[PDB]
Structure 1
C-alpha cells in the first residue's frame, strides 16, 4: 500500500486535524490543488505530525533532513535526529530491522496554503534523495489523541469526517455542513473507543481507506455497517431412486422465522427447498408408482447444491455444516465440505462453486465412499406429499483474511476466526432484514448503542433512516426515501416483540402516529430486529412471499403485448412471477360451460421467461404441442394464475388429479374473434 501516516493541523499545536493521509514516499506535501474540501481559512497548516517505520535495504549511516529543519523535531527509534535546527546527525541503520519514525512540524508564520514538505536522507557516499517508495511504512494500527488505535483521531470520529479520494491518497478530513452537503459525499461517524465500530475484523480506518479484503461488500466499508459472512445452501435439483428414477428441479429460499406477527431473534441460517411438482414425463402418476417402490423398500436421494453468501465479508477455509431435513426434524444427512481445501473463495453476493462451474453433488460419482442419503417408505411418502426440504447451516466459517500493516497485504490469519467475531457483531448491532431486491431476505447489521452500557456513551447515534441508506442503499433523490423506484411506504415495518415496544414508545414520545413521517427521528439500539417487507405480497411464517392480492395479480397482467391460439405474450414484473406457480387455460362456451385445457395439477408450468424480458404463456405445451383450436369465435379463452400458497402439489385424498377446486385468479379473458 503506502508509507507514513500524516496529520495536518490548521492550528499550530496538534489540536484541529484538517487532513489525515499517507504518502508513499518521503514527499509529504499537500498542494493547494488537493484542499478543495477544506474551508479556505483552514487551508493554512501551522503544524503536522507524521508516524511510521523505515526498513532500510542496505545497512549504512544516514543523515536525515527535511525541507524545513528549523521547524522540525524527528525521532528515530526514540532518539532525536533533527531538533530545532539542521541537526545533521549520521545514524546507523541495519537492513531488515524496523525503526520507529516520528516527525513533528511547527510553523507560526504560515504565508502559504497547503504544505510543501519533503523528507530526505543521505547515505555515506553523499547521495541525497527524497526517501523513496519501499522504505517508509505505516504504524501498526491494530487493536496525538487516538484512544482505539485505529488511526482516526478521536475528535474526527465523534464530530464526523469525510473521506475523499485523491490520486493514490485517501484524504480523511472533518465534516463541515455548508461544503460537503452540496458535493454528495457521506458524513462518517465512528466510535473513538472501538477499533471496529461494528465489532467486526476490520478497523474503521482500514474500512474507509480500502486497506481491506477486496471482497468485503462496498456497503460494509462504512464503519457503521458490519462486515461478516452469511451463508445458506441453495439446492438446484434432486434425483430420487429405489435403493438396491425421479429427476426434479428445486427452488430454494433463505428463510427467517417469525413468532406468534413478530420478527425473530435467532441468528441461525436456514433455507427451504420447493421440489417441482410439475410433470417430467407424459403419463406419470405418484412418485412411488414411477419407481416400483413397495411397502418395505428404501429410497435414495442425491442433489446438486451451491453455497450462497448473502453477507458482507468472504469465507476462505471452512464451509459451514448443514443438516438436510425432512418435515419438522428428521435429519436425512449431514453435508460437510473438506476443511482447508476450498477450490475458490466464497465471496459476498456470490456462490460456491461459482455459476460458471458445475455445482456440488451430495454424492459425487467419483466418490465410492460418500455417505448414501436414504429414506424409509413412510418418509418418501411424506416427501411426495409435502415436496419440501429444509437445509440448516451452522455459523462456522473459519479463518479471516485481515490486513497486515508490515506487509501492506491482506492475508488469511490463522489466529483470526469468525466464530469469535460473530457474537460480538450480534451483540452490538441492530439487525435489519430487507426483501426489496428480488423478494429474497437480505440481512444487514448496523452499529448501534446499547443505552445501558456506560462505555457505549460515545458510539454514533443511529437512526432508522441512515441505517436504511448506508446498509441497503435507500436514497432520497427528490425528498422521499426510496429504494430503486419504490417509495419507503411500499414496504412494511415489522419488529421483534421488544423492539416493537421500544419503537412504539419512541413514536408516542414524538406524537407521531406514522413511522414513515419520523424515520430520521427514530433511534436504533443494539439487539433490535427489523423486518422490512414489500407490501404487495402475502408471506408465510418463514417470510417467503407466497402470494399477492387478486387485485395486484390482475393488474400485473394488464399489459398484453400479443395474444393468439398459441398463447399470451405479456410484460410481467419480476417479483410477481416469483409468486406464481403456474397458469390454467380454460375454454368457455356461449352458455358458460367450461373446460380446462391443461387439466391436471402437474400441468400448470406453462409460463416461461424470454431473453427480451417478456413472459410467454404457452397454450401449445399441454395441447399435444398445437395452438388451441377455437371452433366457435364466440367462445372465450380464459387464463388463470395460481399463486404459491394456492398450488396443489399432489392428487386429492380421493385421487383426483384435475385442477378442480384450485383457488385461481382470472388474468385474461377474450373471445375467439378478439384474439385472432
Structure 2
C-alpha cells in the first residue's frame, strides 16, 4: 500500500491533517484515526499536526514521539502535546546577601522573575532586599557598616538557579551578570566549569532545596573582592534596594531518544543555542500569572501567512490554546481556571498584536472579545499577556497591590482574636501584596496610639507551620503583652500593601507612618477581644 509520508515522521499524511490519537489496547499501543463517537467518551484528546514538519513545534522531538511517550521522561506533561514547544527557561533566584568593607549586614532577599514592556526574548529577574530593621539599634546602614567616602564594600551572596521552562538542560550552566541601577554592571558571575553535571528538570532547583546554595563569592583566590563598588554606587543602592540579574540563553546539549535500544543519550552535536531561534520566530507567546502570581511562559505553534511551509500547521484558535497549554476546561461550557471564570482576566497585547486583533474584531462585528473567543485566529509572533484583573501591577508586571475592597473581603473570616494576636487563615495568594500592619489603640473619646510607630518596624506578621497567619505584638513591642486602658476602647488595625510603602526615611528623616495611605483591617472594642 506504501501509505504516503513525505515528512518522514512515522505518522502518515492523511492521519496528521484530519486528526488522530494514540490509545493503549490492553498492553499494546496502537495509533488510530479519530472516530468521533467511540473515542470521545473515553476522555482521549484529539491531536492534529503538520504533514510537512518533522516537528510542528520545531523543537527537537518529532511529532510521533511526543504523543507516544518515547521521549525524555522529564519533559513536562503539558509539553507532550504536539503544538507546544518544549524548551528551557533558566533564571536566577538570589536568597540572601551579606556586606562588609574590604559588623556584616546580612539581610534576606526575595526575588521574582520579571517581564516589562516592547518586551523581548531574554530572561531577567529582579531582587528586592528586605528593608525592615532586624536590630533595634541598627538605624541607618551608612553607619552600621563603617563606610567612608573613600571606602569600598564587599558583596557576598548566595544564589540558586530555577528552571521554569518545560525541558531539561544538561551540561552547561548559563552566565549571568548582576547590574545595579540603570547601567552600572557590578560583576558577572563566572560560569563554573564542568560542575553542573546534574539535571534541571522543569520546576526544580539547582542545587536542590536540601543542600547549601551556591556561594556567589568564590571564597577562593580568584579575586579578593570581585564585587568592588565605589562609594557613589552604595548610595544608589541605599536609595533603591534593587538589583537586576540578566542571564543569557547559552544552554547545553540536547537529549535525544534512540530507537535501537531505548537509550536516552546526550548528543554532543545538537545544542539548544541553535534551536531557540527557530522557536522564537514561528510561535505565539502567551504569558500567564494565574497559578500563584508567577510568570509562566508558553509558546504555541501558529500559522504564518507569508511562508508556504508555515501555512501547513493546523489552525490554532485562542480558546483551544488556553485549554491545552495551561489546563483550562469547560465544566459548563464556560472557560474557567479552577473556579475563576475567564472573565476575571485582562488581555494585553503588543502594538503589532493589538493592531492585528483589531482587524480580527472587525470582520466579525463584535466588540467584547470574551464572547468571540472561539473565533480568534493566532498567527506567528503575536505576544499576549493575561494578568489577574483584580490586583495592581507595576511597570515590570509584578504584583504590587490591589483595590481596598478586595483587601477587606480577604479578612472577613476571623478565626480567633485575643490580647496576644490573631490567627487567620487567608488565601495563600493575597499575602504576597501585603507588606505589614499598623497597630494602634483608640481612646473611648477618639484618641489614637500607634504601637509600632516607626517606618522600618512593620515586619511583625509571621506564618505558622499549618498555614495559619499569626500576628505577634510582642515582637516589635517591649516583649510585653497588650494593655488596654478601657474594655470599651476599640482596637484598629491597618494593612499596608507594598506599592503604598515607603522604602527610605523622608526629607527630614520622618519615621512616622503619617503620609502613608492605610487601609483599615480590624476594629473590635476592648471587651470584644
TM beyond 0.5: yes
Tell me how far apart the structure 2 counterparts of residues 366 and 180 of structure 1 sit (CA, whole Å): 63
Could you give the per-residue CA deviations for residues 323-353 of structure 1, whole angstroms, max 9, x where no partner exists?
Answer: 1111111111112332442142111111111
- Secondary structure of the 1:420 match is helix
Distance in 1 of aligned mates of 2:309 and 2:197: 43
Superposed CA deviations along residues 266-322 of structure 1, whole A, max 9, x for unmatched, are: 110010101000112121111111011111111111111111111111111111211
Give the unaligned 5+ runs of structure 2.
none
Q: TM-score, normalised by structure 2?
A: 0.96
Seen in structure 2, the aligned counterparts of structure 1 residues 247 and 166 have a Cα distance that, compared at 3 Å, is: farther
Q: Offset at 1:606?
A: 1.3
- Cα distance change on mapping 1:153 and 1:532 into 2, 3 Å: same
CA contact (8 A) 1:364 1:370 kept: no
Q: Secondary structure at the match of 1:493?
A: strand
Contact 1:317 1:339 in 2 (8 A): no
Distance 1:317 1:371 in 2: 28
TM-superposed deviation, 1:370: 7.2
- State the distance in 1 between where 2:250 and 2:235 align: 33
Q: Which moved more, 1:347-356 or 1:227-236?
A: 347-356
> Matched residue of 2:228: which SS?
strand
CA distance change for structure 1 residues 168 and 256 in 2, over 3 Å: closer, same or farther?
farther
The aligned length equals 527
SS of the aligned residue for 1:195 comes to coil
In 1, Cα distance between the equivalents of 2:385 and 2:193?
34
Distance 1:674 1:367, change over 3 A: farther
> Of Structure 1 and Structure 2, which has the larger fraction of its residues in strand?
1
Tell whether 2:443 aligns with 1:584. no
Which runs of structure 2 are paired with 1:153-232 in the superposition (5 Å)? 153-166=12-25, 168-232=27-91
Structure-1-length-normalised TM-score: 0.76
User: Could you tell me how far apart the structure 2 residues matched to 1:662 and 1:572 are?
Assistant: 24
CA-CA distance at 1:522 after TM superposition: 0.9
Counterpart contact for 1:481–1:488, Cα < 8 Å: yes
Quote the offset at 1:626 in angstroms: 2.4
Bigger Cα displacement from structure 2, 583-592 vs 391-400: 583-592
2:214 pairs, out of 347, 354, 360, with 360
Identify if the C-alpha distance between structure 1 residues 176 and 439 changes in structure 2 by more than 3 Å, giving closer, same or farther. same
Instruction: Report deviation, 1:244.
Output: 13
2:412 to 558, 563, 569: 558
Task: Encode CA deviations 1:462-498: one digit per residue, 9 max, x unaligned.
Answer: 1111111111111112221111222111111111111
Per-residue deviation, 1:591: 2.8
Distance 2:392 2:22 in 1: 42
Seen in structure 2, the aligned counterparts of structure 1 residues 624 and 364 have a Cα distance that, compared at 3 Å, is farther
Summarize the Cα distance change of 1:166–1:654 in structure 2 as closer, same or farther, 3 Å threshold. farther
Query: What is the CA distance between 1:660 and its match in structure 2?
Result: 2.3
Give the distance between the partners of 2:103 and 2:434, measured in 1 at CA: 38
Other structure's SS at 1:456 match: helix
Q: Cα distance 1:166–1:299, how it changes in 2: closer, same or farther (>3 A)?
A: farther
Aligned to 1:522: 376
- Give 4+ residue runs of structure 1 displaced > 6 Å after superposition: none
**1:67-122 CA distance string (max 9 Å, x none):** xxxxxxxxxxxxxxxxxxxxxxxxxxxxxxxxxxxxxxxxxxxxxxxxxxxxxxxx
Structure 1 pair 584/454, CA: closer, same or farther in 2 (3 Å)? same
Distance 1:623 1:172 in 2: 69
- Cα distance in 2 for partners of 1:464, 1:413 equals 36
Contact 1:567 1:620 in 2 (8 A): no
